[PDB]
Write an enzyme that holds these catalytic residues in place. Structure first.
Site, PDB file in Angstrom:
ATOM      1  N   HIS A  53       0.827  -1.203   0.000  1.00  0.00           N
ATOM      2  CA  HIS A  53       0.000   0.000   0.000  1.00  0.00           C
ATOM      3  C   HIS A  53       0.864   1.257   0.000  1.00  0.00           C
ATOM      4  O   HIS A  53       0.655   2.164  -0.814  1.00  0.00           O
ATOM      5  CB  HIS A  53      -0.907  -0.050   1.217  1.00  0.00           C
ATOM      6  CG  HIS A  53      -1.852   1.089   1.339  1.00  0.00           C
ATOM      7  ND1 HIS A  53      -3.208   0.979   1.106  1.00  0.00           N
ATOM      8  CD2 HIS A  53      -1.617   2.386   1.603  1.00  0.00           C
ATOM      9  CE1 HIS A  53      -3.774   2.152   1.296  1.00  0.00           C
ATOM     10  NE2 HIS A  53      -2.827   3.017   1.583  1.00  0.00           N
ATOM     11  N   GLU A  54       1.875   1.311   0.877  1.00  0.00           N
ATOM     12  CA  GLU A  54       2.655   2.540   0.995  1.00  0.00           C
ATOM     13  C   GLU A  54       3.562   2.748  -0.217  1.00  0.00           C
ATOM     14  O   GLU A  54       3.637   3.861  -0.752  1.00  0.00           O
ATOM     15  CB  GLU A  54       3.470   2.533   2.291  1.00  0.00           C
ATOM     16  CG  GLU A  54       2.617   2.557   3.560  1.00  0.00           C
ATOM     17  CD  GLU A  54       1.678   3.757   3.660  1.00  0.00           C
ATOM     18  OE1 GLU A  54       1.835   4.731   2.894  1.00  0.00           O
ATOM     19  OE2 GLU A  54       0.763   3.707   4.507  1.00  0.00           O
ATOM     20  N   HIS A  77       1.574   4.188  -3.069  1.00  0.00           N
ATOM     21  CA  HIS A  77       1.294   5.626  -3.084  1.00  0.00           C
ATOM     22  C   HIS A  77       2.362   6.339  -3.911  1.00  0.00           C
ATOM     23  O   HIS A  77       2.071   7.282  -4.657  1.00  0.00           O
ATOM     24  CB  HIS A  77       1.284   6.171  -1.663  1.00  0.00           C
ATOM     25  CG  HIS A  77      -0.045   6.091  -0.996  1.00  0.00           C
ATOM     26  ND1 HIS A  77      -1.229   6.474  -1.591  1.00  0.00           N
ATOM     27  CD2 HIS A  77      -0.366   5.642   0.234  1.00  0.00           C
ATOM     28  CE1 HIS A  77      -2.224   6.281  -0.749  1.00  0.00           C
ATOM     29  NE2 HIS A  77      -1.722   5.782   0.364  1.00  0.00           N
ATOM     30  N   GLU A 135      -6.204   5.968  -2.878  1.00  0.00           N
ATOM     31  CA  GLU A 135      -6.266   5.015  -1.780  1.00  0.00           C
ATOM     32  C   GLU A 135      -6.565   3.613  -2.281  1.00  0.00           C
ATOM     33  O   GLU A 135      -5.934   2.642  -1.849  1.00  0.00           O
ATOM     34  CB  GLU A 135      -7.344   5.476  -0.807  1.00  0.00           C
ATOM     35  CG  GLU A 135      -6.842   6.246   0.387  1.00  0.00           C
ATOM     36  CD  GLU A 135      -5.671   5.573   1.057  1.00  0.00           C
ATOM     37  OE1 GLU A 135      -5.901   4.492   1.632  1.00  0.00           O
ATOM     38  OE2 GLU A 135      -4.562   6.151   1.069  1.00  0.00           O
ATOM     39  N   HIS A 177     -10.147   7.479   2.669  1.00  0.00           N
ATOM     40  CA  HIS A 177     -10.068   6.133   3.244  1.00  0.00           C
ATOM     41  C   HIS A 177     -11.417   5.441   3.328  1.00  0.00           C
ATOM     42  O   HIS A 177     -11.473   4.261   3.691  1.00  0.00           O
ATOM     43  CB  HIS A 177      -9.422   6.226   4.634  1.00  0.00           C
ATOM     44  CG  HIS A 177      -7.985   6.641   4.577  1.00  0.00           C
ATOM     45  ND1 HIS A 177      -7.584   7.943   4.769  1.00  0.00           N
ATOM     46  CD2 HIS A 177      -6.856   5.927   4.358  1.00  0.00           C
ATOM     47  CE1 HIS A 177      -6.275   8.023   4.633  1.00  0.00           C
ATOM     48  NE2 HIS A 177      -5.805   6.810   4.392  1.00  0.00           N
TER      49      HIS A 177
HETATM   50  C1  LIG Z   1      -2.387   0.296   4.935  1.00  0.00           C
HETATM   51  C2  LIG Z   1      -2.590   1.499   5.874  1.00  0.00           C
HETATM   52  C3  LIG Z   1      -1.602   1.465   7.018  1.00  0.00           C
HETATM   53  C4  LIG Z   1      -2.463   2.783   5.057  1.00  0.00           C
HETATM   54  C5  LIG Z   1      -2.754   4.093   5.805  1.00  0.00           C
HETATM   55  C6  LIG Z   1      -4.145   3.839   6.388  1.00  0.00           C
HETATM   56  O1  LIG Z   1      -5.120   3.643   5.665  1.00  0.00           O
HETATM   57  N1  LIG Z   1      -4.175   3.721   7.719  1.00  0.00           N
HETATM   58  C7  LIG Z   1      -5.066   4.484   8.564  1.00  0.00           C
HETATM   59  C8  LIG Z   1      -6.492   4.844   8.143  1.00  0.00           C
HETATM   60  O2  LIG Z   1      -7.399   4.012   8.059  1.00  0.00           O
HETATM   61  N2  LIG Z   1      -6.614   6.176   8.056  1.00  0.00           N
HETATM   62  C9  LIG Z   1      -7.708   7.058   8.039  1.00  0.00           C
HETATM   63  C10 LIG Z   1      -9.070   6.801   8.102  1.00  0.00           C
HETATM   64  C11 LIG Z   1      -9.969   7.852   8.120  1.00  0.00           C
HETATM   65  C12 LIG Z   1      -9.510   9.158   8.067  1.00  0.00           C
HETATM   66 CL1  LIG Z   1     -10.652  10.460   8.135  1.00  0.00          CL
HETATM   67  C13 LIG Z   1      -8.150   9.411   7.986  1.00  0.00           C
HETATM   68 CL2  LIG Z   1      -7.548  11.031   7.843  1.00  0.00          CL
HETATM   69  C14 LIG Z   1      -7.247   8.369   7.980  1.00  0.00           C
HETATM   70  C15 LIG Z   1      -4.976   4.051  10.048  1.00  0.00           C
HETATM   71  C16 LIG Z   1      -6.348   3.763  10.665  1.00  0.00           C
HETATM   72  C17 LIG Z   1      -4.058   2.843  10.259  1.00  0.00           C
HETATM   73  P1  LIG Z   1      -2.404   5.533   4.781  1.00  0.00           P
HETATM   74  O3  LIG Z   1      -3.374   5.587   3.647  1.00  0.00           O
HETATM   75  O4  LIG Z   1      -2.616   6.740   5.719  1.00  0.00           O
HETATM   76  O5  LIG Z   1      -0.935   5.469   4.316  1.00  0.00           O
HETATM   77 ZN   LIG Z   2      -3.062   5.092   1.826  1.00  0.00          ZN
END
Ligand SMILES: CC(C)C[C@H](C(=O)N[C@@H](C(=O)Nc1ccc(Cl)c(Cl)c1)C(C)C)P(=O)(O)O
Ligand SMILES: [Zn+2]
EC number: 3.4.24.-
Length: 329
Positions: free
Chosen positions: A164-165, A168, A188, A250
């Protein structure tokens, strides 16, 4: 410095511990034989131990590897371990994950996972043990940074989180999908699709979920996200018609996550074929401010380039209420 091999452990309390050198291949490392020092680094991947700091000089993790204890045990104590918060060795898992992601993009698409502004290949820099109780990971334009989690998550180093990272960065250096609105939901989603592709490359199977392997068993969450039915998480959306302007990327990622799941499960289709269409669209058609509908046009053009069945894609697009008739003006 020469090429060496690293033996040690990975995994966590939930999914179990495994061994590089028995369950999985040995890790690709480097050694300075003059000083009996080893580095968690190879041409393609560098692992940085952030030491629970929020900054670092990004030097590779270095550990003593003596000729008399080629293959060496990983870890600062040469025991195969680098334990933190229920994980055996997040740094080993990061080195392996970078290998998988790099070789997935090279083997499947003949492309670098990451490149510099001038097109030269970019080493995957995987920064581990970031911060104190940091329950996230992030891409910052040049490297991938992973926390050790806290009460809700194990250290966030897995094939899926790494895929995933890194992806990006792949998106930023290709379509450039902007990280808000519909294009941000697509951004995303592509990264969640790549999490599945990394799992598929490694073991020939994928969970259709994001993060189950790092959610603690007492958190009350089985996963971060579900791609078969995104709305299972209480906030993500399953079709484009449920999008609203205040929905975070997300949660609007459910549209293309569900689409990817649907397409991969059409008759004769698999994950790899679905990801082929997505990767080619990201590379060749998607634009930085893409709408969901415009992204479907890009998928159709990509599939046409690849020779893939367009009706199967159109049926999948319709199931997530994407208007592809617009593509044909
Ligand atoms: C595979 C994962 C680790 C990628 C990251 C991610 O999805 N994790 C978070 C998430 O659900 N965020 C989230 C959810 C809602 C809002 Cl409103 C915002 Cl702001 C952020 C967290 C819960 C671990 P990333 O896209 O930030 O790199
Ligand atoms: Zn992400």
């Amino acid at each position: 410095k020469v090429q060496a091999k690293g033996m040690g452990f990975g995994g966590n309390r939930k999914i179990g511990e495994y061994q590089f050198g028995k369950d999985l291949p040995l890790l690709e490392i480097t050694r300075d034989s003059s000083v009996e020092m080893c580095f968690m680094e190879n041409t393609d991947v560098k692992v940085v131990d952030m030491g629970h700091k929020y900054y670092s000089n990004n030097k590779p993790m270095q550990f003593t590897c003596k000729e008399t204890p080629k293959t060496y045990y990983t870890g600062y104590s040469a025991d195969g371990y680098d334990r933190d918060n229920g994980a055996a060795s997040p740094t080993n898992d990061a080195l392996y994950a970078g290998y998988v992601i790099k070789h997935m993009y090279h083997d499947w698409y003949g492309v670098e996972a990451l490149t510099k502004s001038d097109g030269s290949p970019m080493q995957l820099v995987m920064r581990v043990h970031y911060g104190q109780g940091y329950e996230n990971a992030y891409w910052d334009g040049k490297q991938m940074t992973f926390g050790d989690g806290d009460t809700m998550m194990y250290p966030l180093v897995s094939l899926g989180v790494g895929g995933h990272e890194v992806s990006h960065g792949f998106t930023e250096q290709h379509s450039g999908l902007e990280y808000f609105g519909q294009s941000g939901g697509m951004n995303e989603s592509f990264s969640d699709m790549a999490a599945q592709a990394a799992e598929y490359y490694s073991v020939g199977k994928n969970s259709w979920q994001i993060g189950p392997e790092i959610m603690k068993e007492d958190s009350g969450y089985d996963a971060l996200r579900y791609m078969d039915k995104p709305s299972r998480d209480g906030m993500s959306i399953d079709v484009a018609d449920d999008y609203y302007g205040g929905l975070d990327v997300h949660y609007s990622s459910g549209v293309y996550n569900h689409l990817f799941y649907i397409l991969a499960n059409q008759p004769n289709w698999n994950l790899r074929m679905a990801f082929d269409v997505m990767v080619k669209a990201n590379m060749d058609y998607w634009t930085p401010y893409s709408t969901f509908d415009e992204g479907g046009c890009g998928m159709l053009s990509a599939a046409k380039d690849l020779g893939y069945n367009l009706d199967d894609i159109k049926k999948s697009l319709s199931e997530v209420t994407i208007n592809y008739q617009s593509c044909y003006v």
